[PDB]
Amino acid sequence: MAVQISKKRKFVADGIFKAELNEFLTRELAEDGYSGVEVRVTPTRTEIIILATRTQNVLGEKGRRIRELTAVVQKRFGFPEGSVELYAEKVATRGLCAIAQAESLRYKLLGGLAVRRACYGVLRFIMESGAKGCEVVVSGKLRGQRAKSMKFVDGLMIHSGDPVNYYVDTAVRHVLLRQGVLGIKVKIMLPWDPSGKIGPKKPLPDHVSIVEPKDEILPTTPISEQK
Amino acid sequence: MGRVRTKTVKKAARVIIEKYYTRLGNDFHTNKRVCEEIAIIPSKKLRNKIAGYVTHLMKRIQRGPVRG
Amino acid sequence: NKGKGGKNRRRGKNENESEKRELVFKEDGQEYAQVIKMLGNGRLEAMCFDGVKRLCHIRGKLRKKVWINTSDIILVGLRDYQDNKADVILKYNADEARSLKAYGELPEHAKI
RNA sequence: AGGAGUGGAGCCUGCGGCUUAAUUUGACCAACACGGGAAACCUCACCCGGCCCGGACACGGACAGGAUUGACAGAUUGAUAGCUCUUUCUCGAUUCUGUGGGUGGUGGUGCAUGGCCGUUCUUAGUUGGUGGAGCGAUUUGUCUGGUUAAUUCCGAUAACGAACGAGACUCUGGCAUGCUAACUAGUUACGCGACCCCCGAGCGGUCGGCGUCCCCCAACUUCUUAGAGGGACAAGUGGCGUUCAGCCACCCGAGAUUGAGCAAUAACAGGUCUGUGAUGCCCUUAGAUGUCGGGGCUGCACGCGCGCUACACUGACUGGCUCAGCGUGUGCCUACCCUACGCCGGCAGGCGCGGGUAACCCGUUGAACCCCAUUCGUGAUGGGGAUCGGGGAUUGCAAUUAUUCCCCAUGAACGAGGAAUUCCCAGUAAGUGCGGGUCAUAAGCUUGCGUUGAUUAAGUCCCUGCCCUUUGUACACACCGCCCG
RNA sequence: CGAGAUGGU
Numbered sequence: 001m002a003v004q005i006s007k008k009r010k011f012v013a014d015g016i017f018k019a020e021l022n023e024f025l026t027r028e029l030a031e032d033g034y035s036g037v038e039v040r041v042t043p044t045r046t047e048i049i050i051l052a053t054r055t056q057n058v059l060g061e062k063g064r065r066i067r068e069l070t071a072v073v074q075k076r077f078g079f080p081e082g083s084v085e086l087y088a089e090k091v092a093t094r095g096l097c098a099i100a101q102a103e104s105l106r107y108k109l110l111g112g113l114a115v116r117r118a119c120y121g122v123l124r125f126i127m128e129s130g131a132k133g134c135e136v137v138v139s140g141k142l143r144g145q146r147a148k149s150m151k152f153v154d155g156l157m158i159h160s161g162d163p164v165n166y167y168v169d170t171a172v173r174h175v176l177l178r179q180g181v182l183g184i185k186v187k188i189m190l191p192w193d194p195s196g197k198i199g200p201k202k203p204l205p206d207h208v209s210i211v212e213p214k215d216e217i218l219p220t221t222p223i224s225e226q227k
Numbered sequence: 228m229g230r231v232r233t234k235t236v237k238k239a240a241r242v243i244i245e246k247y248y249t250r251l252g253n254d255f256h257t258n259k260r261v262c263e264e265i266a267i268i269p270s271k272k273l274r275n276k277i278a279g280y281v282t283h284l285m286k287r288i289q290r291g292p293v294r295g
Numbered sequence: 296n297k298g299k300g301g302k303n304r305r306r307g308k309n310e311n312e313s314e315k316r317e318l319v320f321k322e323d324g325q326e327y328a329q330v331i332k333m334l335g336n337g338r339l340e341a342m343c344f345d346g347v348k349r350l351c352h353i354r355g356k357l358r359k360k361v362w363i364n365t366s367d368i369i370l371v372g373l374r375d376y377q378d379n380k381a382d383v384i385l386k387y388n389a390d391e392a393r394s395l396k397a398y399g400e401l402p403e404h405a406k407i
Numbered sequence: 408a409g410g411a412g413u414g415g416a417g418c419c420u421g422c423g424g425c426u427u428a429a430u431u432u433g434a435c436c437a438a439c440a441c442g443g444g445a446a447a448c449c450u451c452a453c454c455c456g457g458c459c460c461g462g463a464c465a466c467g468g469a470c471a472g473g474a475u476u477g478a479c480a481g482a483u484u485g486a487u488a489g490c491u492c493u494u495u496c497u498c499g500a501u502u503c504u505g506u507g508g509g510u511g512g513u514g515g516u517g518c519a520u521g522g523c524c525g526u527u528c529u530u531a532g533u534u535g536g537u538g539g540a541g542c543g544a545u546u547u548g549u550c551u552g553g554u555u556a557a558u559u560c561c562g563a564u565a566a567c568g569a570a571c572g573a574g575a576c577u578c579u580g581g582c583a584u585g586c587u588a589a590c591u592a593g594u595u596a597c598g599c600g601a602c603c604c605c606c607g608a609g610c611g612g613u614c615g616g617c618g619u620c621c622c623c624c625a626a627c628u629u630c631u632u633a634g635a636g637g638g639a640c641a642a643g644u645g646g647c648g649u650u651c652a653g654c655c656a657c658c659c660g661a662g663a664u665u666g667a668g669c670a671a672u673a674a675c676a677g678g679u680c681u682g683u684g685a686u687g688c689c690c691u692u693a694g695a696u697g698u699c700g701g702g703g704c705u706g707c708a709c710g711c712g713c714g715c716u717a718c719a720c721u722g723a724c725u726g727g728c729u730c731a732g733c734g735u736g737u738g739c740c741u742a743c744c745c746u747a748c749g750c751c752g753g754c755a756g757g758c759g760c761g762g763g764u765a766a767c768c769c770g771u772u773g774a775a776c777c778c779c780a781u782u783c784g785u786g787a788u789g790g791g792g793a794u795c796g797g798g799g800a801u802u803g804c805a806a807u808u809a810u811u812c813c814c815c816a817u818g819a820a821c822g823a824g825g826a827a828u829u830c831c832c833a834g835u836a837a838g839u840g841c842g843g844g845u846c847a848u849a850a851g852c853u854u855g856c857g858u859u860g861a862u863u864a865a866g867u868c869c870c871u872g873c874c875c876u877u878u879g880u881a882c883a884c885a886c887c888g889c890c891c892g
Numbered sequence: 893c894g895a896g897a898u899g900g901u
């Protein structure tokens with residue numbers, strides 16, 4: 001770069017890069033249980049951290065797939081030789097991640113399991129994992145040539161105002177069967193977690209809580225006490 | 228117009244008075260400071276509304292019983 | 296596109312009597328006819344151009360779709376028995392009826 | 408109650424009908440300046456012609472005196488397409504050929520589907536668990552009354568305890584001489600320094616006036632930027648309220664309704680396959696429904712929709728003076744950006760030479776209406792500027808069916824608009840100009856910003872509709888229903 | 893107490 005690009009173009013181009021990388025990884029690592037990518041920079045080096053539920057499938061027999069993925073990421077995005085490193089990392093609390101639950105429901109349906117038996121199978125596992133509530137939806141040609149939908153729901157679920165940006169986790173997916181495409185949508189509502197990264201640290205806007213009064217003595221008589 | 232107070236305000240004010248009656252009085256600006264240290268309230272604008280109805284209830288309790 | 300009736304009932308699929316309306320001629324067992332009178336009950340009186348008048352009936356596929364009228368031009372299917380009676384197969388627009396007569400397919404009797 | 412209108416005129420632009428080789432097509436409150444749809448080519452799907460394989464792979468055949476590839480010249484052709492015909496060089500196992508099978512498609516079905524969006528519907532609405540009532544569909548909770556913008560609160564009570572919507576929440580506007588602290592932001596002051604004026608107590612001065620004239624190794628944060636905190640609660644006083652929940656006026660105060668975003672359950676045969684490597688089934692597949700050349704999308708007796716300019720004197724024309732805010736900027740394949748200053752030309756425009764990847768350069772963004780002086784004189788007039796002749800620049804591979812721009816000339820209808828009908832309550836309506844999108848060339852559209860700034864209301868259910876309750880029914884395809892001679 | 897019929901998708 002013989003003269004540097006302006007800050008408006010620089011900040012937009014850095015966002016366009018993260019979007020294409022997330023699409024490539026989404027469709028390479030679908031059955032391997034992918035759920036997100038994180039990227040960080042240091043002098044002469046870029047480190048990419050990738051989250052999945054079955055990390056040994058991301059590596060392969062002696063690390064083959066990490067070496068193949070390092071090669072194609074460098075080849076496509078134009079990094080110089082050896083400046084790119086890929087690290088696989090294991091997903092914590094996989095029942096509270098909406099993308100891993102949308103993909104496992106997609107592969108469970110694609111194997112020929114019945115729709116209600118599959119949907120109550122994930123609805124139980126999300127609520128046993130410690131969510132405050134959830135909503136699962138399937139739609140398309142469910143049983144016959146005319147389209148239908150099903151809602152499955154449990155616990156609490158908010159729809160309006162700013163808290164939706166940090167208390168609700170969501171995913172949408174497609175599955176192709178011999179008669180055409182079905183849609184899947186998954187929503188999960190997270191628990192409040194003061195510190196520990198199960199959920200958000202910020203409380204709900206209308207949850208006031210009062211501290212309890214303690215240990216007073218009702219009677220008194222006048223006395224003095226020297227040190 | 229409309230100045231009616233919702234159940235989130237009216238319930239929090241009653242629970243404060245049941246526990247801390249001996250701290251409270253008729254000055255809004257002192258009640259506003261007490262309610263900030265005895266409770267966790269997410270918004271400054273909600274804290275002002277709670278201390279307002281607490282100040283209204285203290286002036287009623289000085290005359291006779293309040294059923295709640 | 297343009298409606299030409301007026302009602303609540305947008306509940307159907309649109310008629311699209313357009314584009315590849317490929318021109319249809321007779322096979323064996325068929326005739327061209329002009330409507331002379333319309334009766335009740337989904338039936339009509341029609342004259343074909345070789346001069347045998349018949350009582351004629353709307354096929355179940357054309358009900359409440361292809362509205363027939365007096366002096367209109369139609370394609371009719373004959374029966375191998377009961378020669379006084381027949382069934383309607385198609386209606387020709389005044390744009391198609393002139394093309395039939397331009398191909399010499401109709402005697403100089405039909406009105407357009 | 409009123410304001411500005413629209414419907415009448417000329418022109419722009421979307422739709423139907425007609426015309427045509429083709430004038431590609433979706434859509435009929437909730438279609439018609441809408442598909443971000445401003446088509447010269449491309450886009451491109453339509454119409455007239457011509458090259459090409461970009462037909463994987465499998466099996467069989469043909470084949471190293473050879474499977475196959477490419478081409479000069481003449482004829483041919485819109486054509487410098489070796490397309491094809493005559494001729495005779497060239498390449499080297501990569502192809503060719505028959506059968507099977509694939510592959511592509513702005514082809515068909517939105518009435519086969521996913522995703523997204525619109526609408527019912529801007530209002531206050533919706534639902535389990537355990538208990539009570541009915542053989543049952545169902546019901547109560549979810550209410551007689553008062554109160555609120557609100558299924559918002561009070562209270563009542565065969566129900567008790569909860570969930571979503573509402574509200575809270577997020578962004579934004581108006582206040583801080585208090586805090587943090589600035590050569591990519593300023594002020595004040597002086598060591599002072601410089602130009603101009605004497606108008607000034609008084610000189611041509613220490614001292615006065617004027618400055619986007621210039622240094623500070625002066626002091627500072629009022630004006631600009633932007634981080635943290637503060638502030639408003641129906642909190643205070645007087646009335647009215649089953650004296651509760653609330654409602655009205657007033658003091659003090661920057662301020663006692665700022666404006667947007669997000670939004671439930673259940674639906675619709677609503678729109679979209681022409682946004683997609685989202686997609687089932689059907690069609691087509693070498694004389695192709697997968698690339699180049701030319702034409703069309705603009706065609707004009709006629710009906711309709713959203714708009715621009717006007718009918719003048721509360722004006723038009725010619726000079727002079729003086730004030731904004733929101734933004735964008737060297738294109739990463741893809742090859743283009745925003746402009747000061749000097750010179751040539753009436754103008755559009757041309758040449759030279761610098762700054763800017765931006766609180767740094769265009770830039771103190773010298774904006775329009777408005778403001779001051781002049782000319783015209785109630786005349787289709789010096790109002791209005793449609794229609795049409797001749798000449799000159801700029802973009803581009805190409806401007807004719809006129810791309811856009813400049814100049815002289817020509818000088819239509821129109822004198823405040825029939826029956827009808829739209830939007831609007833305060834920095835609002837209306838007037839007035841400037842940025843962004845689309846862009847090689849270019850707004851009469853749309854999405855934002857500032858500037859000048861009113862009249863009329865503080866209400867009602869009459870007209871068109873929405874919410875809740877009681878009531879009647881021969882309706883459930885649900886009054887655009889059903890039905891008799 | 894004016895006049896207020898009818899119904900392809």
